[PDB]
Amino acid sequence: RVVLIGVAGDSGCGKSTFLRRLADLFGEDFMTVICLDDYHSLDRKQRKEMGITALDPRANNFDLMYEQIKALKNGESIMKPIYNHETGTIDPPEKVDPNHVIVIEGLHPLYDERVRSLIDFSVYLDISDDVKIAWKIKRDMAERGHSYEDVIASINARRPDFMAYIDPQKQYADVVLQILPSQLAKEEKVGNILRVRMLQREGIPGFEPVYLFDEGSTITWIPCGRKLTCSYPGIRLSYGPDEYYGHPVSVLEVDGRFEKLDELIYIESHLSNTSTKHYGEVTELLLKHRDYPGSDNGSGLFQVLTGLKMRATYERLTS
Amino acid sequence: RVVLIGVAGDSGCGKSTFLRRLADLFGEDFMTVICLDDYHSLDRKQRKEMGITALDPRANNFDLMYEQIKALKNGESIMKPIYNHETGTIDPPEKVDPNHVIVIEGLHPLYDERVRSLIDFSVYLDISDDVKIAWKIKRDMAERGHSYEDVIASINARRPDFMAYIDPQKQYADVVLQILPSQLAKEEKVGNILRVRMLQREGIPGFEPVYLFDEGSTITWIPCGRKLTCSYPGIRLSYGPDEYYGHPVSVLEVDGRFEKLDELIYIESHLSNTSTKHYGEVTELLLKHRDYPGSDNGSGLFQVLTGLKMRATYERLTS
Amino acid sequence: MVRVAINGFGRIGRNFMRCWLQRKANSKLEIVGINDTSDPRTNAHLLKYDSMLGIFQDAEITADDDCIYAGGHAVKCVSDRNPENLPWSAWGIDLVIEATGVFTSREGASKHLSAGAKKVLITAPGKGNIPTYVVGVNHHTYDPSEDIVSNASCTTNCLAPIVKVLHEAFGIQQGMMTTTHSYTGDQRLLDASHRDLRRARAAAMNIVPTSTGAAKAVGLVIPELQGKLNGIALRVPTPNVSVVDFVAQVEKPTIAEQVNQVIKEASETTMKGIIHYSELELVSSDYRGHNASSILDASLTMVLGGNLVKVVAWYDNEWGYSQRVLDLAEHMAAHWA
Amino acid sequence: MSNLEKQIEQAREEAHKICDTEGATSGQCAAAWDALEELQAEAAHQRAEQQDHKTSFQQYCDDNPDAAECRIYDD
Numbered sequence A, B: 001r002v003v004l005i006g007v008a009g010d011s012g013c014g015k016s017t018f019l020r021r022l023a024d025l026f027g028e029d030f031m032t033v034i035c036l037d038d039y040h041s042l043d044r045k046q047r048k049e050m051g052i053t054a055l056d057p058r059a060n061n062f063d064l065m066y067e068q069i070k071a072l073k074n075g076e077s078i079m080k081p082i083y084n085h086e087t088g089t090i091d092p093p094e095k096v097d098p099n100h101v102i103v104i105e106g107l108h109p110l111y112d113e114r115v116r117s118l119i120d121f122s123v124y125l126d127i128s129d130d131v132k133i134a135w136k137i138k139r140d141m142a143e144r145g146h147s148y149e150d151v152i153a154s155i156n157a158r159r160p161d162f163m164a165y166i167d168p169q170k171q172y173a174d175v176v177l178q179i180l181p182s183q184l185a186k187e188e189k190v191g192n193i194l195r196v197r198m199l200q201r202e203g204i205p206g207f208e209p210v211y212l213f214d215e216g217s218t219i220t221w222i223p224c225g226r227k228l229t230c231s232y233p234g235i236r237l238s239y240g241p242d243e244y245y246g247h248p249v250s251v252l253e254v255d256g257r258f259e260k261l262d263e264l265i266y267i268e269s270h271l272s273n274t275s276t277k278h279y280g281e282v283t284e285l286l287l288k289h290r291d292y293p294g295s296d297n298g299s300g301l302f303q304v305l306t307g308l309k310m311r312a313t314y315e316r317l318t319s
Numbered sequence C: 001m002v003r004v005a006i007n008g009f010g011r012i013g014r015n016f017m018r019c020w021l022q023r024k025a026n027s028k029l030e031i032v033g034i035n036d037t038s039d040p041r042t043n044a045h046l047l048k049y050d051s052m053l054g055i056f057q058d059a060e061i062t063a064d065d066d067c068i069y070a071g072g073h074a075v076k077c078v079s080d081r082n083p084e085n086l087p088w089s090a091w092g093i094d095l096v097i098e099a100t101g102v103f104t105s106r107e108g109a110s111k112h113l114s115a116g117a118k119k120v121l122i123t124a125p126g127k128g129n130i131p132t133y134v135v136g137v138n139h140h141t142y143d144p145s146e147d148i149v150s151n152a153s154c155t156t157n158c159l160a161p162i163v164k165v166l167h168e169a170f171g172i173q174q175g176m177m178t179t180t181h182s183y184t185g186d187q188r189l190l191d192a193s194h195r196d197l198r199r200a201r202a203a204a205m206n207i208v209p210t211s212t213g214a215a216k217a218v219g220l221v222i223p224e225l226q227g228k229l230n231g232i233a234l235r236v237p238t239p240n241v242s243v244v245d246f247v248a249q250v251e252k253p254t255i256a257e258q259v260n261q262v263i264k265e266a267s268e269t270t271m272k273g274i275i276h277y278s279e280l281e282l283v284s285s286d287y288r289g290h291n292a293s294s295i296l297d298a299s300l301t302m303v304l305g306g307n308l309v310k311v312v313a314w315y316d317n318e319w320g321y322s323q324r325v326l327d328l329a330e331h332m333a334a335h336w337a
Numbered sequence D: 001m002s003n004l005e006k007q008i009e010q011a012r013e014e015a016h017k018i019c020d021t022e023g024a025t026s027g028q029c030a031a032a033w034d035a036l037e038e039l040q041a042e043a044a045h046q047r048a049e050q051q052d053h054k055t056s057f058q059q060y061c062d063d064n065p066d067a068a069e070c071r072i073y074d075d
């Protein structure tokens, strides 16, 4: 069989740690990675000539990617082209073979509707603009390129078509992870502690939600107290039924910074329908890689929760 | 055996509906009522001569009440005097007999320390001053006595010694119910919807707490959502471990107005250690008396929860 | 317009005729034939002067020895005990309403089909696998080629909507019932000889008990509860109306107020016109002539241990049952094939 | 009520007098307002008992229970 997983976000294709957590979960033996900048129509020269970004529905051969994607189901080794990233040009293609798990990730994994009918499980990954700025400050600060504070003006110039081109895809994804500045902590820089939330969608079977103590009644839980000595500022979870874009969703939400072990196992003991064959398996998957960015906050929690639901969908698809 | 229950509050002795809910729970066959204005030393004439309220530790024969209270344990029929309430004077006493359950309620049920060593289970009942004003407006409005708005100046004159005389008793009670103005609803009169909270104390065995989904981690739950269509404004529960007066307590807290049936059974299905032999027994005890004041809000919930814990203590004391 | 007939002009027949006289304008049914063991002079009098529903008032009743004029509307009438000598094809009869209490078998009721009738609706729990249908539970799921259909007994016709509501809302493991039933015509008045001994005794004097399988007919009309419902009946000296006690063992626990809430909203959404809900302290004779097939008595509903519920339901076994017969007849007229 | 009906207004007059004259914040007029609040409390206790005034049945079955209007053979 062929299963398929759609990831959506502008974190750079193969440049986000969610794929790394999926690699720790499945293994690169069982899955292969497909970037989606490879199906660009023409180059950055023709982007400058046509005056167009890399976000245009003109800018990709959306039909040949569909033909290779449908041929992925039939077992044959696909021949996919490669965007030469340094030059902006296009490599003559590479013949790669299908695997047990196939992923699809790029700026438009979901813009096509026939592949939206093809993708077995979908993830959009949203980022608020504040932590965009806080990540670009780290981007041009660690490199010391000295290109800051007009990239601020690049943000809002990149903004308007992006909301037209990309953001209506989240109206069709299953799970969407938003990352916000933390309301809890104020006297830091604006990107230390994240306020993350995984708006997951009901409906489509196999995918359960992961509900905190009750399906469908908003519950804001702080695990500090008689059995956990919370540091500053500690965790503040949330939950809530909601209808996002007129669709039955269930936001599960975490604010805070995981400082130690027991506060991360105590949270995991109380989530429900998390689909583990193993007690504390989510905590083990958190602490197999202490060095990954975002393990100390809820981003690494939610990414591995989504990947664990991907295990659930894979077990549903392969019996 | 002889069991004993201490109730503390200035709601008038035998003039609060918590005793009525206890009557619906136990029965006046199994319990008897003892007012504690009867042990006054001298009359309102001598209150005017001595310049003293009915709240003085001078103003009661605290030793003869202790002698009758200790003789209550030994089975003999006590001979208690009676405060003639209309005249302020004192009746020659009445010979009443002990029962299965004995209650004690007044302004000082707990000021003595030997009877504090005697009382098997204790309840203080606190009232905020705002709903004091909102109840006295109903007091002088329904009667149409036309004595309002200088009773406002009677409040703060009654205040200062009351905080000296009475309020340090709550540092030794088990369960204390505070009643507050509702933060949830604003465009009403100030006494419609109550924000009630039952600060209950750990420690002393037999008395469990009643915890909402977790012992000892603050959790603010709103039961609106997929299975309950909430009216305005709906319910907003709470919970939290705390240390009140340096004592390990666990506040359970309700804000809102119960408008119908399913929102009152759905809350009761999720409380824990409520000590019922019967499913939904708390909802039945709510709706055996729809006419009682405060059944539509959390006051009637918390009073019957405390009375149900009194059933638990009675079953612990009688095996 | 469907030409219909009535076999046996007894209590159910007179009530059926009176109901159709009160629901004439909205009817695809025209009553054109009756037959009783009496002459046409007597049963017109018995139609006009019912000692239970009073004197009929809306239309004029008269007769001569061959026809009966009800309100100007003529209806034919004959007398024969053999169903095989009956003018059905001579009268053009689609649906005959078996109400004699005699022809409960398939082979008995099919004599009308042989003699020239197209469909037969029998108002009794029939022997053998006759397809049974209750209005309000499964009056949709009949195949229109089933020409021999059966309405169940009045007790089943009352009890089954309540059991449907409680099975959908809570789920039922087991269930008893004990209907306190009004005395019917089968009992002998004084102590006379009779096939069953407990019906042989006096009706006006006695609580006579009887065993019925009409509780099991709920297991026919609701298939997943068959072999789980059983109960007895008590015939007491009241002439018209009756009440049914029902003890179910649900598995989803609840309280007494919640089942009343469930049945109250089911009275207003789905079972409207079938189940009425009454929070009054009424008594039996305030249900003579009520249109619903079950009035749930609210003040007596009780739950012990969470998983054991008791309801009681007033129902008129002479008027509401006739209403459900006529509703089933119109509903099979609306899906004539 | 006539006696306490007068006495509440008398203690209200005293509440206006003694706590404007002999010290607005001391034990004396706090005892005065405490007294007036107890008079008000007994007015409340009279009020609630007159709200619970039965019309006929808890009178005619109070004195003569076995009449046919209130025999209850709760059996």
Ligand SMILES: NC(=O)c1ccc[n+]([C@@H]2O[C@H](COP(=O)([O-])OP(=O)(O)OC[C@H]3O[C@@H](n4cnc5c(N)ncnc54)[C@H](O)[C@@H]3O)[C@@H](O)[C@H]2O)c1
Pocket (backbone or CB within 6 Å): C007, C008, C009, C010, C011, C012, C013, C035, C036, C037, C080, C081, C082, C099, C100, C101, C102, C123, C124, C153, C154, C184, C185, C186, C317, C318, C321
């Ligand atoms: N009695 C009720 O309230 C009630 C309720 C529900 C169902 N039912 C069922 O309705 C049926 C009839 O009830 P009922 O009270 O009208 O009965 P009934 O005995 O009072 O009246 C039946 C009528 O049919 C006549 N009859 C009998 N056999 C006949 C035959 N072979 N040919 C012609 N006429 C014949 C009788 O002489 C009488 O006129 C029975 O099956 C009964 O169980 C009765």
